[PDB]
Design an enzyme around this catalytic site. Structure first.
Site, short mmCIF file in Angstrom:
data_model
loop_
_atom_site.label_atom_id
_atom_site.label_comp_id
_atom_site.label_asym_id
_atom_site.label_seq_id
_atom_site.Cartn_x
_atom_site.Cartn_y
_atom_site.Cartn_z
N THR A 87 0.57 -1.03 0.02
CA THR A 87 -0.06 -0.40 -0.22
C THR A 87 0.99 1.47 -0.21
O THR A 87 1.39 1.41 0.60
CB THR A 87 -0.62 0.09 1.25
OG1 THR A 87 -1.93 -0.91 0.97
CG2 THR A 87 -2.29 1.32 1.04
N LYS A 141 -7.26 2.03 -3.60
CA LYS A 141 -7.03 0.98 -2.25
C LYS A 141 -7.35 1.95 -1.11
O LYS A 141 -7.40 2.56 0.49
CB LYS A 141 -5.60 0.56 -2.02
CG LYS A 141 -5.40 0.35 -0.58
CD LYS A 141 -6.23 -0.74 0.04
CE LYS A 141 -5.56 -1.07 1.57
NZ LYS A 141 -4.24 -2.04 1.54
N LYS A 155 -0.24 5.81 8.45
CA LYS A 155 0.45 5.79 7.23
C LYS A 155 -0.29 5.89 6.24
O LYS A 155 -0.53 6.25 5.28
CB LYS A 155 1.37 4.56 6.54
CG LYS A 155 2.34 5.15 5.44
CD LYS A 155 1.22 3.78 4.50
CE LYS A 155 1.19 2.55 4.82
NZ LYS A 155 0.82 1.09 3.85
N1 LIG Z 1 -1.65 -6.13 7.90
C1 LIG Z 1 -3.00 -5.93 7.03
O1 LIG Z 1 -4.56 -6.33 7.65
C2 LIG Z 1 -2.89 -5.40 5.89
C3 LIG Z 1 -4.30 -5.45 5.09
C4 LIG Z 1 -4.16 -5.20 3.68
C5 LIG Z 1 -2.48 -4.39 2.75
N2 LIG Z 1 -1.20 -3.87 3.74
C6 LIG Z 1 -0.54 -3.61 3.59
O2 LIG Z 1 -0.03 -4.45 2.71
C7 LIG Z 1 1.82 -4.19 3.20
C8 LIG Z 1 2.64 -4.76 4.11
O3 LIG Z 1 1.98 -4.70 5.70
P1 LIG Z 1 2.63 -5.93 7.56
O4 LIG Z 1 1.45 -6.07 7.36
O5 LIG Z 1 2.11 -7.38 5.58
O6 LIG Z 1 3.43 -5.22 7.13
P2 LIG Z 1 4.72 -5.73 8.15
O7 LIG Z 1 3.99 -6.73 8.63
O8 LIG Z 1 5.26 -4.50 8.77
O9 LIG Z 1 6.74 -5.96 7.50
C9 LIG Z 1 6.05 -4.90 5.60
C10 LIG Z 1 7.51 -5.64 5.52
O10 LIG Z 1 7.77 -4.95 4.31
C11 LIG Z 1 9.52 -5.00 4.96
N3 LIG Z 1 9.92 -3.58 4.52
C12 LIG Z 1 10.36 -2.59 5.57
N4 LIG Z 1 11.11 -1.54 5.71
C13 LIG Z 1 11.69 -2.38 4.37
C14 LIG Z 1 12.54 -1.21 3.72
N5 LIG Z 1 13.70 -0.56 4.15
N6 LIG Z 1 13.70 -2.13 3.37
C15 LIG Z 1 12.59 -3.38 2.32
N7 LIG Z 1 11.92 -4.20 2.99
C16 LIG Z 1 11.47 -3.46 4.25
C17 LIG Z 1 9.65 -6.02 6.11
O11 LIG Z 1 10.46 -6.92 6.09
P3 LIG Z 1 11.19 -6.70 7.39
O12 LIG Z 1 10.77 -8.07 8.36
O13 LIG Z 1 13.08 -6.78 7.38
O14 LIG Z 1 11.16 -5.66 8.71
C18 LIG Z 1 8.12 -6.61 5.78
O15 LIG Z 1 8.44 -7.80 5.02
C19 LIG Z 1 2.01 -2.62 4.09
O16 LIG Z 1 1.75 -1.59 3.27
C20 LIG Z 1 0.64 -2.97 4.63
O17 LIG Z 1 0.41 -1.71 4.15
C21 LIG Z 1 -2.20 -4.81 5.11
#
Ligand SMILES: NC(=O)c1ccc[n+]([C@@H]2O[C@H](COP(=O)([O-])OP(=O)(O)OC[C@H]3O[C@@H](n4cnc5c(N)ncnc54)[C@H](OP(=O)(O)O)[C@@H]3O)[C@@H](O)[C@H]2O)c1
Ligand SMILES: NC(=O)c1ccc[n+]([C@@H]2O[C@H](COP(=O)([O-])OP(=O)(O)OC[C@H]3O[C@@H](n4cnc5c(N)ncnc54)[C@H](OP(=O)(O)O)[C@@H]3O)[C@@H](O)[C@H]2O)c1
Ligand SMILES: NC(=O)c1ccc[n+]([C@@H]2O[C@H](COP(=O)([O-])OP(=O)(O)OC[C@H]3O[C@@H](n4cnc5c(N)ncnc54)[C@H](OP(=O)(O)O)[C@@H]3O)[C@@H](O)[C@H]2O)c1
Ligand SMILES: NC(=O)c1ccc[n+]([C@@H]2O[C@H](COP(=O)([O-])OP(=O)(O)OC[C@H]3O[C@@H](n4cnc5c(N)ncnc54)[C@H](OP(=O)(O)O)[C@@H]3O)[C@@H](O)[C@H]2O)c1
Lengths: 287, 286, 287, 286
Positions: free
Chosen positions: B95, B170, B238
């Site tokens: 996102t 989104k 965010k």
């Molecule tokens: N959770 C939900 O219900 C949901 C639903 C729909 C969409 N989303 C969206 O989907 C996306 C992922 O969300 P999530 O909940 O999976 O997030 P998350 O658990 O916080 O993980 C985010 C991922 O991004 C990586 N990352 C962060 N900073 C980085 C960097 N500087 N360089 C390379 N990799 C980096 C992290 O790697 P590391 O492991 O190394 O930290 C992790 O693999 C987000 O944009 C979120 O808004 C989330």
């Protein structure tokens, strides 16, 4: 034989009073503007000349009025409820008002020897017509019980929430959420159109996910059509938010979101949409 | 035929796992390599960098935290741009804002790759279940090629046009969701202050026109005071931030979104950044 | 013998560059729209074809540009600052931008062998004309010292606030307060006129008490006249609130008040008042 | 000739004292009788109830907390209405809404008394110094009769027309003040977070177009973290509450005032109701 009174034949009160007549109760009606009684009289209700006349003659009188000012004027004013109620007769105020108003009305009615119950409802014009309101009652338990057959003609669900005031509080909390949901949907659709998004697709995406609800489905179509036929008057939505914010003030509960939504609804009133459906707040959210 | 997957977080882990279980040939990478282990055990291969993945896989999906992360994985050293080419596809499901996805797409395309953005609606459980709603925009042929993979990840798939349209949809959807959460939170806070039973409040809501799965699910967190993370609070903040910025660019005032954004910032400042986004309740109730 | 460059001859830049020419400095000017150079050349300035051309030939170049996008484009774009700056020549960006932008420009200028100073200002069109700006500088101390005589022609007060970024932050904090003061005055005057109060008397009461300030006096007259000739463009005030809210985001600092003001200024932009004075936010606060 | 004074609070005390020092024949009353002792020591007489004061004095002034207080002193047992009459005057200087002052005025007039509302702009020090700005509305003959007293209480006095106009002007002025305080507070909070010197911020503000005594004075409280009470925070919140309600009646939206009102409510909830209204800062900073 329990006889029924009904004060306030508005968007909600008309259909509600009609449901009691059609269910077969003996109903006496009154409305400040007498012309609104006509369809109810033709259905079989009797017309009365004042709230006092209704409450003197009817075992249980229901009121469905605009706001705290209306509720208080009908109760305390000349030829009002207090001049007729007594002898155990009941007054059920289903108007959406604050808890201080319902408490004051109840104390007054009780002091005249009447019984009082507040019973504001969740559900708009169509639910009122269909008899599928959710009734949020509080106050006299014997009156709640006595009104059971009438509540079955009016609603699909009836709760008794304790002492007078708890019903009003529940209603205001529920509608505060609803007002913020409407501004959320409105802002979303406004931003969406500016984005070039297809509004119908936006609604379809919302309806397929965790936020899916009937209000979004129905109000969404108003947003697409630009037509806002009145189910719940915008002025009354703004009144409910006003009351929620005042309640928060009294309880020391900050409400940034509710306060912001309240002012957006005031903008919509200012822009001439007070008598349209509350979804018409969209008209001041989109350019 | 071959797939790559970058970002094994709360969403990316389950997503990648669905592709492996569905029998796709999957190569994974994550900034923290430890996160790869569980997927390797399921049958995924592991790579040392995004460039390594994008050089070898026909189609690479990314599921990253925010625009900064997306841009770093794309433009950084050993990033996507150093490997993508030859018609190989990059599908960023993170996102982000439309400016970011547009920029990433332009760079990928210039390198001879194909780009599609495809952010999703649906949280941790839907990701685990493969019931996400996929909001795609960009290269048509890549969207078509991605069909089988998308079917394993989601229950619904849309192509919304040119790059940017998916990001906009989104952000619009999550902006509504953010405001719905503060609305439920403020209502429950006021209700409890009023001496009402929170369970009865939820029951009234579930019986009426506003009834929805989110209120039902998050409502129980509000009652228990426990906020196990499905959608991190920081990521919700965010999303509201991005929506307000989008409104800024498009000349759309958003008083409600802006107010909700600041309440979520209060919740971040109060230490709830890594809890479920419903934990905004903790700064709304006394 | 220090020579001077000046990029951006807008509402602020025109009068600022003119003060340098009148003080007797050798000034070379550039503006994206070259027509705005005419009046400055008529006063004795020379004209250049690009920022690169100016920064290659002048000892100190000042920029007064709209926003972060403009500042970055003039710095990093084709024929921009970085293509000409070097040899210890100075670049002083007086544009109001965020701290990340000024930090990035400073780093890039320094990498090319230039010296960088950020120096946003507090004070609007008349102070720019009169040379009474407040200059909020941060960055290279030798360049701050070298620019002393030029700063004396531009401002009445000059501060060095430390490392690059500190001047931007001070400017954004100052303007965030100013933006909120403008909506406060606007809302007060709108409510007042709705109350049937005389707006002149309201202003007189404010000027006799603890809130009395020159901004209320000056902007108050605009509100009364309904004309908003531009001293500080509404679009730039909205930009400043946007940057303050983004700064707060980065620092984990909630700003409900600034956020609300930001959205009101966006409404005023959407309603077509982007290029009027920022006091024109009144047009969407009043009915 | 003879004067009454009801309500000896932060403002009422110094105001009554100015009247006594100026040589007026003053009779005082306060719900809490202990507050009268200092005035009596200066040469005031003391009465047992508002009724008693209003039955005996040509002109009686009230300086009470809020509409609730003003209504109770007027309409309650032993209240103003049980004593006022014979053309004797009641001047209510409390900050209340126009509906309250109108209702009080109507009742006083029906009892044969004269009524004037006269809320004031200026805080504790101006009250002590007799430099209040008096915003009167109502009976013209009473305004004239009160001239000598107003001269000892204030530096400026306006007659703004029919009852209600003074209350409206007061609420408008204080609504602006409340928003200026949250503006200053948010600015100082952000500035401190930015690593800026708070003293320099105040200095830059004082050199420019926004420079004003309030920023200078309240600014120093923000730096010291001490909020000795000049204008109670709970009364600022009350004033914003009333401004929002007035806007509601007039169909005037007030996003800024509404947001400031909720921030002041947060400050009350945090325990700062009796501190100076500048203590709203304590809930704006982290
Ligand atoms: N959770 C939900 O219900 C949901 C639903 C729909 C969409 N989303 C969206 O989907 C996306 C992922 O969300 P999530 O909940 O999976 O997030 P998350 O658990 O916080 O993980 C985010 C991922 O991004 C990586 N990352 C962060 N900073 C980085 C960097 N500087 N360089 C390379 N990799 C980096 C992290 O790697 P590391 O492991 O190394 O930290 C992790 O693999 C987000 O944009 C979120 O808004 C989330
Ligand atoms: N519409 C909905 O979806 C909905 C749903 C749940 C609850 N409610 C609540 O139900 C109540 C009635 O709403 P509604 O939609 O029926 O509103 P409405 O159509 O505006 O009707 C208001 C009623 O109150 C009467 N009234 C107003 N002021 C009065 C006064 N001073 N003295 C005597 N009667 C007065 C009106 O009489 P006149 O005909 O003489 O004007 C009319 O009968 C409100 O509290 C509303 O918030 C509405
Ligand atoms: N006005 C005030 O009261 C005031 C006070 C303090 C600080 N400031 C700040 O000072 C800066 C300038 O303000 P202003 O009122 O002078 O603004 P302005 O009149 O709108 O002028 C902006 C200048 O930037 C140039 N510009 C915009 N986009 C550009 C781009 N992409 N590439 C190259 N040049 C570009 C414009 O060039 P063109 O002529 O080609 O359009 C113009 O010269 C702003 O940051 C403003 O916030 C203003
Ligand atoms: N302080 C300022 O800077 C300032 C400036 C301009 C205007 N004002 C306004 O002036 C008015 C007085 O303010 P203040 O600062 O003097 O307030 P304060 O110190 O809190 O005093 C309030 C006064 O009202 C009395 N009171 C409260 N409730 C009462 C009731 N139910 N019945 C009878 N008396 C009651 C109190 O009596 P007890 O002693 O028995 O509690 C006290 O004398 C307020 O409307 C305020 O908003 C204040």
């Amino acid at each position: 034989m329990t006889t029924y009174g009904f004060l306030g034949l508005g968007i909600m009160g008309g259909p509600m009073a009609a449901n009691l007549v059609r269910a077969g109760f003996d109903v006496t009606v009154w409305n400040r503007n007498p012309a609104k009684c006509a369809p109810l009289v033709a259905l079989g209700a009797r017309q009365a000349s004042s709230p006092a006349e209704v409450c003197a003659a009817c075992d249980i009188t229901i009121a469905m009025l605009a706001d705290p000012a209306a509720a208080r004027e009908v109760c305390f004013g000349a030829n009002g409820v207090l001049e007729g109620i007594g002898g155990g007769r009941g007054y059920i105020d289903m108007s959406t008002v604050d808890d201080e108003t319902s408490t004051a009305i109840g104390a007054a009615v009780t002091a005249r020897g009447g019984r009082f119950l507040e019973a504001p409802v969740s559900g708009t014009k169509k639910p009122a017509e269909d008899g599928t309101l959710i009734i949020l009652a509080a106050g006299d338990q014997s009156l709640f019980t006595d009104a059971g057959p009438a509540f079955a003609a009016l609603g699909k669900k009836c709760l008794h929430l304790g002492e007078v005031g708890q019903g009003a509080r529940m209603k205001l909390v529920v509608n505060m959420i609803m007002g913020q949901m409407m501004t959320a949907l409105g802002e979303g659709m406004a931003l969406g159109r500016n984005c070039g998004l297809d509004g119908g697709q936006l609604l379809e995406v919302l309806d397929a996910g965790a936020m899916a609800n009937p209000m979004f489905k129905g109000k969404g179509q108003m947003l697409l059509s630009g037509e806002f036929p009145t189910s719940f008057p915008l002025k009354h939505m703004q009144k409910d938010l006003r009351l929620a914010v005042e309640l928060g003030d009294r309880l020391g509960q900050p409400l940034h979101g509710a306060a912001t939504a309240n002012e957006s609804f005031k903008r919509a009133r200012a822009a001439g949409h007070a008598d349209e459906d509350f979804a018409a707040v969209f008209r001041v959210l989109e350019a």
